[PDB]
Write a protein that binds this ligand. Structure first.
Ligand SMILES: Nc1ccccc1C(=O)NS(=O)(=O)NC[C@H]1O[C@@H](n2cnc3c(N)ncnc32)[C@H](O)[C@@H]1O
Ligand SMILES: [Cl-]
Ligand SMILES: [Cl-]
Ligand SMILES: [Cl-]
Length: 379
């Protein structure tokens, strides 16, 4: 029984009020501090005619204020459309249109939407009442994803899709003790692993500087703020293995997700220190990270497996007759669907699995299983 994100963050900030929530450069913000500003901004947002269900795009460079907006937007039940800060003004319009945004809140287009100054909203903060009744199935965010061919499709993600990240993952052993690094762009689903596994568990989220990755700054930041849970794309992981693999063993866990990573790169990383290196699978339509496989030995490693699902995630490889290859995902992370309701039927299908009908997302990832109970993608 998952509650909506603000309900979870509320009781998280009430439990651990004095723990550090956000770090930027050297500025620190505690959970009680963050909760007060979130409620103050949410009241400001309501003054600006924003109501529950409004489609609100966010374009704010990495900063403490960015994640206050995220919390405030979902506290007032808005549907956030995070936009990449280096996106060209033309692709901004395509994203706003495909999501049907009524607002764009930005720190720096032309369509049926209002542009709101993020700096002015922060300046207007004076908690105020009247907050919506939010369910786990209420929409929480829209993310754009491209397929093997088509144009960018909008994916409607429910509160449960990221609220599940409040539950500790057994393969990670994470808790409020941990520290996460925010480096993945907010327009990507992978960013949800870093933002919400932190804020919804009482852990710390150190924010990387805005812009393209600065591995020197990322190196000192990973150590200075003692990052324990490091999520990485395949490119950031491979580059670190090549130029500074020692950095990958300051944390306790390193999760590589996004695409096939050469098994030799995992071998160098695992043999380099005490950090548990993971291969992870995620997709936009399942809201965030979905499975994990722990690389155990330098010679234990044939595409590396993606492992076993996260809490409340169901992952099954079905045959060609929609029965048990091809990967299907069910559970709390499944998206509400696409903007196109007809393509929604094409790739979100109800399938009987162990007695009960279950809604599965059709991933289009050819796959098969391991002997030791492990999912393995194979293009
Ligand atoms: N890397 C993430 C972490 C959390 C949430 C989403 C993502 C993500 O890639 N969202 S996507 O929509 O842009 N891409 C989704 C598609 O990418 C591919 N893929 C993702 N992980 C892996 C992996 N370990 N090995 C091989 N292939 C992978 C797959 O074909 C999946 O269907
Ligand atoms: Cl700016
Ligand atoms: Cl997000
Ligand atoms: Cl940024």
């Amino acid at each position: 029984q998952l509650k909506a994100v603000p309900d979870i963050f509320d009781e998280i900030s009430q439990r651990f009020p004095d723990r550090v929530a956000l770090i930027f450069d050297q500025r620190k913000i505690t959970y009680r501090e963050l909760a007060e500003q979130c409620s103050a901004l949410a009241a400001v947002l309501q003054n600006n005619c924003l109501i529950k269900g409004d489609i609100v795009a966010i374009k704010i460079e990495r900063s403490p204020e960015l994640y206050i907006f995220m919390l405030a937007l979902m506290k007032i039940g808005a549907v956030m459309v995070p936009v990449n800060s280096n996106s060209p003004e033309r692709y901004i319009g395509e994203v706003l249109s495909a999501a049907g945004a009524r607002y764009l809140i930005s720190d720096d287009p032309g369509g049926a939407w209002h542009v709101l100054s993020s700096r002015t909203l922060i300046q207007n903060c004076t908690r105020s009442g009247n907050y919506p009744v939010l369910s786990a199935d209420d929409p929480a965010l829209i993310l754009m994803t491209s397929g093997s061919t088509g144009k960018p499709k909008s994916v409607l993600i429910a509160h449960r899709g990221i609220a599940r990240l409040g539950l500790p993952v057994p393969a990670l052993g994470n808790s409020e003790r941990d520290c996460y690094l925010q480096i993945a762009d907010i327009s990507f689903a992978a960013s949800a692993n870093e933002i919400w596994m932190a804020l919804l568990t009482g852990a710390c989220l150190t924010i990387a500087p805005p812009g393209l990755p600065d591995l020197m700054a990322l190196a000192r930041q990973i150590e200075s703020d003692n990052v324990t849970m490091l999520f990485l794309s395949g490119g950031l992981f491979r580059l670190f293995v090549e130029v500074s693999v020692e950095t990958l063993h300051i944390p306790d866990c390193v999760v590589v997700s996004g695409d096939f990573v050469n098994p030799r790169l995992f071998s160098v990383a695992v043999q380099a220190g005490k950090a548990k290196i993971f291969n992870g699978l995620g997709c936009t339509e399942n809201s965030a990270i979905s499975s994990l496989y722990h690389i155990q030995s330098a010679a234990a490693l044939s595409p590396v497996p993606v492992g076993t699902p996260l809490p409340l995630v169901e992952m099954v490889v079905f045959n060609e007759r929609l029965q048990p290859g091809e990967l299907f995902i069910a559970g709390a992370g499944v998206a509400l669907g696409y903007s196109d309701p007809q393509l929604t039927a094409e790739r979100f299908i109800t399938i009987p699995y162990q007695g009960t009908d279950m809604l599965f997302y059709r991933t289009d990832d050819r796959a098969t299983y391991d002997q030791d109970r492990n999912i393995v993608l194979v293009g």
